[PDB]
Ligand binder design. Structure first.
Ligand SMILES: Nc1ncnc2c1ncn2[C@@H]1O[C@H](COP(=O)(O)OP(=O)(O)OP(O)(O)=S)[C@@H](O)[C@H]1O
Ligand SMILES: [Cl-]
Ligand SMILES: [Cl-]
Ligand SMILES: [Cl-]
Ligand SMILES: [Cl-]
Ligand SMILES: [Cl-]
Ligand SMILES: [Cl-]
Ligand SMILES: [Cl-]
Length: 859
């Protein structure tokens, strides 16, 4: 086929032939990496996240509950699972359903960290998409919508169910509450969705102790066969508590009681168990190893760890300390008058509404003096903010308030008074507008030195050098408070977080500061008890907020809440399942997984191929020297529009640490779309498949003919079978003389390619037609040589495919014997996939892809 094009007049350029071979060779090599799908994401390599992603991401139709605590990376873990299944072909269509306020968070995270462009489906986008198909969700492969959107219409819900999704992601799944007599519409929608999508990821950090019926109902959504009875599940969790405590004491060091181990041995039921148990419970020279084998066999028999992952902050340390600094300020008489007239108008207004309103006195003032009324003239919080920023000009400060209107007013007064420039975040801006404001604030280069945020939820952007936070006001519930602090209290952040709270005395602000700090300790330590206690004392705490002058019993309430907080906190830590924690973080095997990816990171093959790829496609690279390159298209582009480019130009980097510091830059790996789209572009057609060249070599007779043939050995099969793990389309380069000697083993490609020069068209065409009959005789000589070569590759693959898939099949069958969380369809998927892989490798052959004729000259 390629020689027919050559003898018919197609002569390709030298760089096209070379790049075609290189791109096929590197594609063949990068597919077989054991860590594919975990390299391309713009994240740090945290072992507990990679352990979850590497386990769940390679399953057939994964159905797990991701229950890591707040800030531990549930969005990143879900993104890594999506990244693998989409890259490998195991999934094609993904549906992410989140609370309405977290939609933009997931769009930014999935695009800027995993290169996944999701489509937000709201009511206006839904009506737009209806014009194109019967099912409007068929118009996009990756969509995000809200719980309210999914539940609102039965007809729209049916379309969402029949849209043939491969993976379903539900964030903040604790919003799905089990109710025996009145399940919410959003519960019913997710329940129906979960029966129609094979792969489901439920995300919620809620402890099962704060609600057990809902926790079991979420697990039953994942596997209704295993989790079929609630009372049985409750009894299982009770029966297991002594085992988790005895195990916890083991790793803690204190040795075990006689009856405490025959209880570990009963749950690990097997005949010869005494030697291992005694070796572990000895603290000898062998006990260190003996416990890893012990807990390993206990994790395989754990009742829920196969489908439930829960890392904790006490288990995975690495979060910064949080320091509270309160600043009590006098109440100006303008607010005194505004509050009084407000109380005269709201004698009937509910205590709940009065409590919330008086938290933001600039809104009370404007509600009587008009919008944009000059409250910033007398508000002492503004003056304190002025003095703090003017005396801290070299550090990045993040200021948060509830309302955008207040945040936008602060930007103006701070600019008009002290000349300080501030980036602003609020819900009224576009994602791209917030992208610029973020990059402006991220500059250590006299960037924006203060970032002003409304209550808008964080979109995952990392501000490395930001460790100082000002709460201009306080949010109304403790869940919003931790979301605020989480903007800087990030994993891997080393500097202590300074939280400054300027507040007005004897107002609802002063009451809320006391309750958050003294009652919940919510500022300096992450609060797992806030919501639970807040619900119990809501209409009680509201009264003290609404009437800050009458403080009778407030100290008693604070005492009540703090004692309940401390008790619930310590109880959650006692019930912490250490065996579940170890399975969640992955131990030393996960640390090795993190090291292996970081070693693979610095890829000189990639930089080489990427620059060779961009020259041919026609991209102009401007190396800014700072580990960053600016890509701008040129005139001589192959395709008019190459996917990832814009006429404004994009910034790229190959270094993972630079990519984390500059999220405005593309993180180029073998798994980046720019690379995968460039590979497919040059390997799609026939460009570079047929050419002729001259070799200036005096050590060889004039006119001697060599042909270098690029064969490709491949099987044909659907991508979901994942045949590329064992036999991707693989090039087999041969270099033949007139007798058929294969010299490719002693003639390195790049060394020999640098000596082959193109021919002008008129001489080149004359030369090809002259040597044709000899070339045909050499082509016939190769067909026998490629056969033995291709048969060695296929037989190598079908043995490696049979060996790998036998291990996976045996591993899942060993688990099913001791674990109830192995689904029937999982065992059938491996058994069927293995048989189909063997059958596709049986029908694998060879073809000639490209050939380059070489004629020796002395000129
Ligand atoms: N490996 C990582 N590398 C870089 N940033 C990370 C990593 N893991 C987490 N982050 C950031 O830390 C923050 C917390 O991540 P999340 O996954 O959202 O935390 P989460 O609380 O477990 O999940 P939700 O859905 O937000 S409640 C985000 O700003 C992430 O971008
Ligand atoms: Cl050329
Ligand atoms: Cl919602
Ligand atoms: Cl419940
Ligand atoms: Cl400073
Ligand atoms: Cl953000
Ligand atoms: Cl407040
Ligand atoms: Cl007040």
């Amino acid at each position: 086929k390629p020689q027919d094009r050559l003898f018919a007049g197609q002569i390709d350029r030298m760089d096209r032939f070379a790049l075609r071979y290189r791109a096929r060779k590197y594609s063949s090599e990068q597919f077989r990496m054991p860590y594919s799908g975990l390299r391309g994401q713009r994240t740090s390599l945290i072992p507990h996240q990679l352990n979850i992603a590497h386990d769940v991401g390679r399953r057939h139709a994964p159905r797990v509950l991701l229950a890591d605590e707040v800030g531990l990376g549930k969005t990143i873990e879900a993104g890594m699972i999506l990244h693998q299944q989409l890259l490998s072909g195991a999934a094609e269509r993904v549906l992410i359903i989140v609370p309405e306020t977290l939609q933009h968070q997931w769009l930014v995270e999935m695009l800027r960290r995993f290169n996944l462009r999701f489509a937000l489906f709201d009511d206006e986008r839904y009506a737009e998409a209806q014009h194109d198909a019967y099912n409007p969700f068929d118009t996009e492969q990756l969509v995000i919508c809200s719980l309210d959107f999914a539940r609102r219409s039965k007809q729209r819900l049916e379309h969402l169910c029949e849209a043939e999704w491969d993976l379903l992601v539900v964030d903040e799944a604790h919003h799905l509450v089990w109710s025996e007599d009145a399940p919410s519409r959003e519960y019913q929608a997710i329940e129906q969705l979960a029966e129609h999508v094979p792969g489901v990821l439920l995300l919620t950090a809620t402890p099962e102790q704060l609600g057990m019926e809902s926790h079991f109902a979420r697990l039953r959504l994942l596997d209704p066969n295993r989790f079929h009875d609630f009372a049985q599940f409750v009894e299982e969790q009770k029966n297991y508590r002594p085992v988790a405590d005895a195990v916890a004491m083991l790793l803690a060091g204190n040795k075990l009681s006689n009856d405490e181990l025959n209880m570990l041995g009963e749950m690990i039921g097997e005949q010869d168990i005494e030697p291992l148990l005694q070796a572990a419970n000895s603290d000898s020279e062998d006990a260190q190893s003996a416990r890893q084998e012990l807990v390993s066999m206990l994790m395989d028999r754990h009742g829920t760890s196969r489908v439930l992952f829960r890392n904790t902050r006490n288990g995975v340390k690495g979060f910064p300390k949080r320091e509270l600094h309160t600043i009590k300020l006098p109440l100006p008489t303008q607010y005194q008058t505004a509050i009084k007239v407000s109380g005269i108008m709201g004698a009937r207004k509910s205590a709940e509404d009065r409590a919330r309103d008086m938290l933001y006195p600039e809104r009370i003032y404007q509600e009587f003096e008009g919008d944009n009324a000059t409250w910033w003239n007398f508000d002492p919080r503004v003056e304190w903010l002025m003095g703090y920023l003017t005396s801290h000009r070299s550090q990045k400060v993040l200021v948060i308030c509830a309302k955008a209107a207040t945040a936008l007013q602060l930007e103006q007064v701070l600019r008009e008074r002290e000349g300080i420039r501030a980036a602003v975040f609020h819900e009224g801006m576009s994602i791209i507008e917030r992208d610029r404001a973020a990059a402006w604030f991220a500059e250590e280069d006299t960037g924006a030195q203060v970032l002003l945020c409304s209550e808008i939820g964080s979109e995952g952007r990392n501000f490395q050098f930001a460790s100082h936070m000002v709460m201009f006001d306080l949010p109304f519930n403790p869940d919003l408070l931790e979301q605020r602090i989480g903007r800087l209290d990030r994993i891997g952040q080393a500097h202590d977080i300074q939280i400054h709270v300027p507040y007005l005395e004897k107002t609802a602000q002063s009451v809320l500061v006391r309750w958050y700090h003294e009652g919940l300790d919510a500022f300096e330590h992450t609060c797992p008890t806030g919501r639970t206690i807040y619900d119990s004392v809501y209409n009680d705490l509201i009264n003290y907020l609404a009437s800050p002058d009458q403080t009778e019993g407030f100290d008693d309430l604070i005492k009540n809440c703090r004692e309940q907080h401390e008790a619930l906190k310590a109880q959650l830590e006692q019930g912490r399942d250490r065996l579940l924690e170890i399975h969640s973080n992955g131990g030393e095997k996960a640390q090795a997984l993190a090291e292996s990816i970081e070693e693979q990171d610095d890829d000189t093959n990639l930089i080489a191929f990427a620059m060779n790829l961009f020259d041919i496609i026609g991209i102009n690279q401007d190396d800014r020297g700072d580990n960053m390159i600016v890509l701008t298209p040129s005139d001589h582009m192959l395709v008019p529009d190459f996917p990832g480019l814009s006429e404004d130009g994009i910034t790229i980097t190959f270094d993972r640490e630079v990519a984390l510091a500059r999220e405005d830059a593309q993180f180029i790996t073998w798994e980046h779309p720019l690379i995968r789209n460039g590979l497919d572009l040059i390997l799609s057609g026939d460009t570079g498949s047929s050419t002729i060249s001259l070799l200036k070599n005096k050590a060889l007779p004039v006119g001697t003919l060599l042909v270098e043939l690029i064969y490709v050995v491949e099987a044909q099969a659907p991508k979901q079978l994942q045949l590329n793990r064992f036999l991707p389309p693989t090039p087999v380069r041969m270099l033949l003389d007139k007798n058929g000697n294969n010299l490719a083993a002693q003639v390195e490609f790049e060394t020999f390619n640098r000596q082959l020069n193109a021919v002008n068209r008129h001489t080149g065409s004359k030369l090809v037609n002259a040597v044709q009959q000899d070339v045909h005789a050499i082509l016939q000589l190769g067909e026998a040589q490629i056969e033995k070569s291709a048969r060695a590759l296929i037989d190598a693959a079908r043995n490696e495919a049979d060996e790998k898939l036998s291990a996976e099949l045996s591993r899942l069958e060993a688990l099913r014997a001791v674990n109830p969380n192995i689904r029937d369809d999982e065992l059938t998927a491996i058994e069927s996939n293995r048989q189909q892989v063997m059958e596709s490798l049986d029908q694998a052959g060879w073809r000639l892809d490209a050939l380059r004729l070489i004629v020796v000259t002395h000129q």
